[PDB]
Design a protein around this nucleic acid. Structure first.
Ligand SMILES: [Zn+2]
Ligand SMILES: [Zn+2]
Lengths: 199, 199
DNA sequence: ATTTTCAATT
DNA sequence: ATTTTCAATT
C-alpha cells in the first residue's frame, strides 16, 4: 500500500496527464519536471525530510518578469530554499520528458552548481530526445561534462513515480509493452551521443 | 511561516495553474474544488499538521472506465478517513468556483451526512453564480435546507488561499481590479435568492 | 454592472 | 513504431 505523504495538499497530479505524457506519443511543449531529495547516511539512503514534487515548464508572469526556459532552472532556485548542508551528500534526481536543452544559463548555471557543490549528485532521466539545431550534440557534451548521469526511464521507475506522485486506490498503473522497443531506439541515440567522445 | 511547510511534497500547484482557475471565465468541466478542515478545541480553532487539499475534474477516459463524478463525492469518502469523532466539533468549509451542481450524490449525500452528523458545521462559499436558471434556484434551495450557510469570499481570502496552495516565496499575489465589481454582482445575486423567502 | 481560459468521443 | 524537440499574451 504505497501512498504519497499526507503532509502536503491532496493536490495529486492529474493521472490522465501523467499517463498522457508517457502515453508513448509524440508531442511535448510544456510537460513537467519531477524531482526528489534523499539524504545519504554512511552509504545508506535516508529520506528524512523527503522532498517530492513537480514543476511546470510554462513560466507565465509578465508582472513579475520571471521567465523559465526549462523547469530545471526553476528547481535550481529551489535548492537554496532547502539550504542543503555542503558537509552532507544528498542524492537529487530530475525527471523530465526531454533531457537535452539549449541555453547558456541552463547549462551554465547547472554546470556551475555542480562545480560549486561537488558533494551533490545530480541524476537526470531522459524520457524523450530534445535535439534541435546542431548545438544539440554540443549542448549534451557541455551539460554531460558535470552531469555525466543520464539514464532512460524504465517501467519500474514509471510505476514508482506513478504511485509516488499519483495516488490511486484499487486502480494500479498498467504498463504498456513499448518501453523495450522505445528504449532501444532512444538508447541507440544515447550511445551515439557518448560515442562523440572518441571523435 | 505563512508559506505551507516544505517538509511535505512540493507537488503543490504552480501560481500559473492557480491564476488560470481563478480566471473566472465561462465554461464547464475542469471545475476546481478546495476544502479545508479545522479542529475546534474548547472554543479554540486548531489545525492538524496539514489536511488541506483540492480536487478537479481532471481528464476523462471511458475506455479506462472513467465516470463523470463530482469531486464532492470523493471528498465525502475522505471524511471517514479523517475518523472525525461526534464528541468534538469540526469546521469543514468547501470552496467552489461555481455554486450550481447536479444533486447526483453530493446534495443527496450532503443532506444525509448533515442529518447523521449535526455536530458538524459545513460552510459553502460560491465564488461565481451562473450556470442554470431553474437548477440554480433549486440547487440553492436544496443546499440551503441543510447548508443554510452561503457566503462569498473577499480578496483577502483569495490572497491567503493563493499563498496557501501556491509555492511562491517573496512573490506576493497580484490581484486584478475586478473583485469590487464582482462583489456587488455576487452580493446582489446572493441576496436575490434569500428575497424568495419574503415571497 | 458584464466579459475571457483549461478540458472531452470514435 | 516515433520526426516528436521544455518558451508565451491578455
Ligand atoms: Zn535546460
Ligand atoms: Zn455536485
Amino acid at each position: 500500500m504505497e501512498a504519497s505523504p499526507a503532509s502536503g495538499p491532496r493536490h495529486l497530479m492529474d493521472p490522465h496527464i501523467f499517463t498522457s505524457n508517457f502515453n508513448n506519443g509524440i508531442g511535448r511543449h510544456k510537460t513537467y519536471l519531477c524531482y526528489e531529495v534523499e539524504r545519504l547516511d554512511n552509504g545508506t539512503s535516508v529520506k528524512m525530510d523527503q522532498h517530492r514534487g513537480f514543476l511546470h515548464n510554462q513560466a507565465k508572469n509578465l508582472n513579475s518578469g520571471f521567465y523559465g526556459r526549462h523547469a530545471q532552472l526553476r528547481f535550481l532556485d529551489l535548492v537554496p530554499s532547502l539550504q542543503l548542508d555542503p558537509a552532507q551528500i544528498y542524492r537529487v534526481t530530475w525527471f523530465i520528458s526531454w533531457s537535452p536543452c539549449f541555453s547558456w544559463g541552463c547549462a551554465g548555471e547547472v554546470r556551475a552548481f555542480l562545480q560549486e557543490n561537488t558533494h551533490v549528485r545530480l541524476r537526470i532521466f531522459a524520457a524523450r530526445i530534445y535535439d534541435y539545431d546542431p548545438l544539440y550534440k554540443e549542448a549534451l557534451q557541455m551539460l554531460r561534462d558535470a552531469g555525466a548521469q543520464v539514464s532512460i526511464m524504465t517501467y519500474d521507475e514509471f510505476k514508482h513515480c506513478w504511485d509516488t506522485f499519483v495516488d490511486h486506490q484499487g486502480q494500479p498503473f498498467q504498463p504498456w509493452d513499448g518501453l523495450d522497443e522505445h528504449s532501444q531506439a532512444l538508447s541507440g541515440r544515447l550511445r551515439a551521443i557518448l560515442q562523440n567522445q572518441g571523435n
